[PDB]
RNA sequence: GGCAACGGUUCGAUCCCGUUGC
């Protein structure tokens, strides 16, 4: 009975969002396990966890949008853009409050960004940190990114605190950096907190801890660690939420479930679905129109 | 299932996802 679900994680500080992943998929013993993007060692935050059947849907979630807290310690750049690194340059703030609301407004909007050379971006088959970490440099290309909504929480001292929503693969710690240059004291990220990633309802985020307490508190009662675990996670096919669902009726899916397009009522005009079964409205995977109008499997559920 | 190339995701995912080849 493989575990099925989303769980909402909190990542701990210092810790790569690859080993959250593993000692939470070792926690609920489940066979697979991915997450749906990534949170430096520095920051903390919702990291969405798909387990088993769930991780098939994943594609959703890292495409959606995230909104983060970050607070930046201007006048110094590090080599990272990060507190995590070293500082390359150090000097003195000296921007006048009308220029620091010029540049926050820059970057609002649908604008291009350069990623820093420590990231998982690939080049030739190679993570670009990668190529940091040997001290070389490869050619970037400006991706496109959006900015919802920046937010100027405040500005005291050497700090910078702010609140943004933006589109997915936004690297905030690269418009710290710019923007470090563009008031011209330089600027890199001391603090990182992702709120949330898509529409999901941060009150259901736990910590690492929390799950060890829960499965302490299981040995304990001797009931199994299921019984308290498996209530926290979100349906698996809440990653595609954002789609119109579809439901068959039993004879209908039967064709549905061996690759067979079919026809029903209230089949969208076109884009995917999610398809569930007669009664219950069962969830059996995603679905995709047609040409025809009809109904193609695109990726189920076993 | 798997193996390989390449890409994705905010950086120490071989591990999750996608394209392509076998």
Known sequence: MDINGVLLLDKPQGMSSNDALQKVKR???????????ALNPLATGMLPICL???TKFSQYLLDSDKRYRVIARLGQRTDTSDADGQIVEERPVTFSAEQLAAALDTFRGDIEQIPSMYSALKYQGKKLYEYAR??????????????YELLFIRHE??????????????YIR??????????????????LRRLAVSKYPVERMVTLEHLRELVEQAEQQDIP????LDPL??????????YPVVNLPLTSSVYFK?????????????????????????????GEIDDEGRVAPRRLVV
């Not at 660690?225 to 308290?228: N, V």
């Not at 061996?258 to 995603?286: D, Q, W």
């Open 27 to 37: 926690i609920y013993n489940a066979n697979r396990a991915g997450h749906t993007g």
């Open 52 to 54: 088993g059947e769930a």
């Open 134 to 147: 040997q001290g070389i440099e490869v050619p970037r290309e400006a991706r496109p990114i959006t900015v």
């Open 157 to 170: 001292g050497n700090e910078l605190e702010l609140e943004i929503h933006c589109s997915k693969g936004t």
């Open 174 to 191: 690269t418009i710290i950096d710019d923007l470090g240059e563009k008031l011209g004291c330089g600027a890199h990220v001391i603090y």
């Open 225 to 228: 660690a299921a019984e308290l």
């Open 233 to 242: 996670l979100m349906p698996m096919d809440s990653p595609a939420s954002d």
């Open 258 to 286: 061996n690759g067979n397009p079919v026809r029903t009522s209230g089949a969208p005009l076109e884009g995917l679905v999610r398809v569930t079964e007669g009664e219950n409205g069962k969830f059996i995977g995603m």
